[PDB]
Structures are given as structure tokens and as C-alpha cells.
């Protein structure tokens, strides 16, 4: 069960810029050749977003170290991560992140997504452990590193995977009306963010933490190593804010262009006319 995988501190706050990325179809209603203006929780243009290094290696000098933080969800979250290796499996969203309240668990595996809203006693350092089943001759995944006790399940949703050269994955999370609304676009490496699912979970979402997968390290006799290491991983988190946007829909319905009206006086002039 729970592994006590703490490093001294998240010392550097890493930042970057969200040039034009967080534009999500705010409604599912098809419109054609139109200029629809909406006030909604968008990612502001040229916002300063944060680069998180979750698994960040120490060169020839040292082995890797682990800094996966619990983060606020505030009013919304733009998530982004371009990764070759299935290290980022999902997220946990919730309030207390212990039993006292319920919380949301989103874990994506090679066959399926599992989405759960249930009272989880989350381990203080959370991950999904992948181990070798000698009989099967395949590696298999254990969820009990994430949660040690499961109680009071109201929601279970199992479906086809989303997160599964480098393939940028972009996500927008909202929790409004008791409805966890998820928007997603994958990009192999201007682009519409197209809705994934609206889950009726009906819970308070105030904070979240990324879910990471750590292969078991079958150590030789003398190592003092953790026993849980898997590749390297990094991700980008930004926060949605209330904004009026002018979205331009195609003849085919596609959002070809959008403008943040509060960014600069020119964008306001395009907005008013």
C-alpha cells in the first residue's frame, strides 16, 4: 500500500506562456457561419501558465526525484502534457482528499478509463503501481497505492481510453451544476477543443492532484533505492477565468478563430463591432 515518497521541497516555480491554446466549444449546439459572443470560463490569451516537472532526473550525477503536487482547481483547470510514455494516467479531484468527504478518481489504462466518485482514503503520496504477474507473464496495475480504503461509491463510469512521435494532450476541466465537464484535443507532434464527457457527479471540486504510474523497481540486494521509478514526466497547468470571448464558427460549424475581448484595445474594438 501507501509509499512514503517525499523529497524536501518544490523549490523552483516554473512558468511559461499560453499563447492562444485554451478555446473550448462552450456549447454543443451546432452553429454555421456565425460570430457568437459568450461570457464563460476560458483560459485567458497570453496567460502565464506553470510548467510542472513531476519526474525530473538528475543526470549522470544522481537518480531521479519526485515532486508531484496537489494543486487548487479554483474555478477551472487547463491541463496539458506532451508525452511518449504512459506515465500520466489521470487525476484525482476532490476537497479533503481523505475519507471525510467524497472525491473523484480518473484513471486511464490501456484497455479502459475508470471514473469513480467515492470516499477514498488517499495515501499521502499517490500513484498507480505497475507490477509483474508471473503467472500471466504481463505487468498489471494496482490501484491500492492510490487509495487504501474505498467507501460510499455513488459513481462508476468505465469506457474507452483517452490519454492511453510525441503526442500533445490538451484538457479543460470544469465542475459546474454538479456536472464534471471535460474537453479534450490530442495533437501528434488553430485548433478546436472538442468536448469529451459531462459526468453528473454532483460533488465539490476545490483541489486536485495528477495521477502518475510508477513501475516497480526490482532492486538487487544492496540498493537503498525507492523501488518505484518510471521514466520522466512533466505537465502544464493553467486556471480558467471568467472572460467574454468572440468565437467565429465555420460554415461546417468549426471554430476557426476566437478573440479574447479584454486582452488589448484592438481586440475590444473587434469585439464591440
Amino acid at each position, epitope marked *: 500500500q501507501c509509499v512514503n515518497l517525499t523529497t524536501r521541497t518544490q523549490l523552483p516555480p516554473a512558468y511559461t506562456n499560453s499563447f492562444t491554446r485554451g478555446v473550448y466549444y462552450p456549447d454543443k449546439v451546432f452553429r454555421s457561419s456565425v460570430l457568437h459572443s459568450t461570457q464563460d470560463l476560458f483560459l485567458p490569451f497570453f496567460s502565464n501558465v506553470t510548467w510542472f516537472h513531476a519526474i525530473h532526473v538528475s543526470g549522470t550525477n544522481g537518480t531521479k526525484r519526485f515532486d508531484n503536487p496537489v494543486l487548487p482547481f479554483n474555478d477551472g483547470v487547463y491541463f496539458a502534457s506532451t508525452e511518449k510514455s504512459n506515465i500520466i494516467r489521470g487525476w484525482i479531484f476532490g476537497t479533503t482528499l481523505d475519507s471525510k468527504t467524497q472525491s473523484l478518481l480518473i484513471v486511464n489504462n490501456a484497455t479502459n478509463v475508470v471514473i469513480k466518485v467515492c470516499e477514498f482514503q488517499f495515501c499521502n503520496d499517490p500513484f498507480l503501481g505497475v*507490477y*509483474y*504477474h*508471473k*503467472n500471466n*507473464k504481463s505487468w498489471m496495475e494496482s490501484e491500492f497505492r492510490v487509495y487504501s480504503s474505498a467507501n460510499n461509491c455513488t459513481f462508476e463510469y468505465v469506457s474507452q481510453p483517452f490519454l492511453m512521435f510525441k503526442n500533445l494532450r490538451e484538457f479543460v476541466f470544469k465542475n459546474i451544476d454538479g456536472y464534471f465537464k471535460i474537453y479534450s484535443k490530442h495533437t501528434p507532434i488553430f485548433s478546436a477543443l472538442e468536448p469529451l464527457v459531462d459526468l453528473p457527479i454532483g460533488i465539490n471540486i476545490t483541489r486536485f492532484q495528477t495521477l502518475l504510474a510508477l513501475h*516497480r523497481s*526490482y*532492486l*538487487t*540486494p*544492496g*540498493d537503498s533505492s525507492s523501488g518505484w521509478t518510471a521514466g520522466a514526466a512533466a505537465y502544464y497547468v493553467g486556471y480558467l477565468q471568467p472572460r467574454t470571448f468572440l468565437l467565429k464558427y465555420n460554415e461546417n460549424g468549426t471554430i476557426t478563430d476566437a478573440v479574447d475581448c479584454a486582452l488589448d484595445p484592438l481586440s475590444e474594438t473587434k469585439c464591440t463591432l
Partner: antibody
Amino acid sequence: QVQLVQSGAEVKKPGASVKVSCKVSGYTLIELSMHWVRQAPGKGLEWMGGFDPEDVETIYAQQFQGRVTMTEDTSTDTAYMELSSLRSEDTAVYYCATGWAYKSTWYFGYWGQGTLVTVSS
Amino acid sequence: QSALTQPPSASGSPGQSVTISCTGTSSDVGGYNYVSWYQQHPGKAPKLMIYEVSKRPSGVPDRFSGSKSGNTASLTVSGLQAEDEADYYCSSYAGSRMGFGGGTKLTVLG
């Protein structure tokens, strides 16, 4: 690290049957293959049998055919080894050892303290 | 049991280097690189010293190193210190079986 703790020593008479346990800690039984060897007084190590990682099938050495039987219980994390038709030659210390299954590098990294089976009428 | 051939004793003055050889066939030591080496102090359970032919587990000092040539492997113990007086057992996969071989007693000569 993995830690292997065996059953206490036992005394038997010729013709009897003996069963030795082996409790594994630190890593669960389904992640590491189990092999049993024995050492007679002063003599060398002799492989009794083990588990083939690539071909999932316990392997028994030619010496102990239809006479040894090795079983594992994954829930209790305990490995078992039953030897029937005991005779004075079987008087030895019996070690349970372990090698990783993924790599299959046939290196018995970790050993039990040993179980002394003493056969004498 | 006795599948691999390995000498009865190994003499060495302290500080010197000793080499214990483990001789097999093309089907056990000559066919694979799955050779291993084990120390054993008297009345005490064995201990791994060399894994995968040349590799060494941590905590084992630098002075132990092994290799193989043709059908014969060998363990070499330099910087002889009295902690090394023990029996030394080699081991290797035979394709269907894993068989330890004989013994050898380093005798730190005093």
C-alpha cells in the same frame, strides 16, 4: 529488500514426509520466482527445484522425481516444499531462495536462514 | 549438485589476488551469461557476490569480480582480507535446470 523466513527445524524418521514453509516480505510472491536448495553437513549446495519464469511451470530436479512437491499460496505469501520417502541422506539444511522473474537472470539474490531436517531412527 | 567442476581449495596470502574457476560445458556456462557466484561462511546461509557474469550487487566490495571464457567462468578476489575466508559456489542455468557446482574454500593464509 525481500526477506525470506522459513519454518522451524524438524526431526523425522525413515519413510516419513516433511513440509517446509517460507514466508516472503518486502515484495509479494507473484513478482519473484521461488527455488529450493539443500546443503548436507559439510557438503555443497544442491538445487531441488524452482519456478521457470518464461515457461510458467515449476521445475523439479532429476534427483527428487515424484518425491518432492513444491506449492505456493499467493494470499499468505508463503512457499511450500513437501518431501516424501525420507531417508538419512536427506538430513540437510533446506534453504528457500529467490530470483526475479521479469529479468530471468537465474541469480538467487536472497536466501532464507535455512531449515534443518534431521532424519534418523 | 556437482554439475559444474570447481577446485577444492584456493590458497592466498592477505592482500594478494585469488582466482576460483568454474568449468562447465557449452550448454550451461558456455551457452548463457546467466552465471552467478555465492559466498558462504560456515554455519551461515549463502550470500550473492557476482550476478550476470561480471556484474556485482551493491555492498559487495570492488575487489570481487568475475568473468567467463568459453566453457569456463572464474571469480577473482583481489585485496584479500580475512572476511573472504569462506566456501565459494558458482551457479548457472542449463536450459532446463539450474545447477550449483561443488565448492571451493579460500584460505586466507595466516
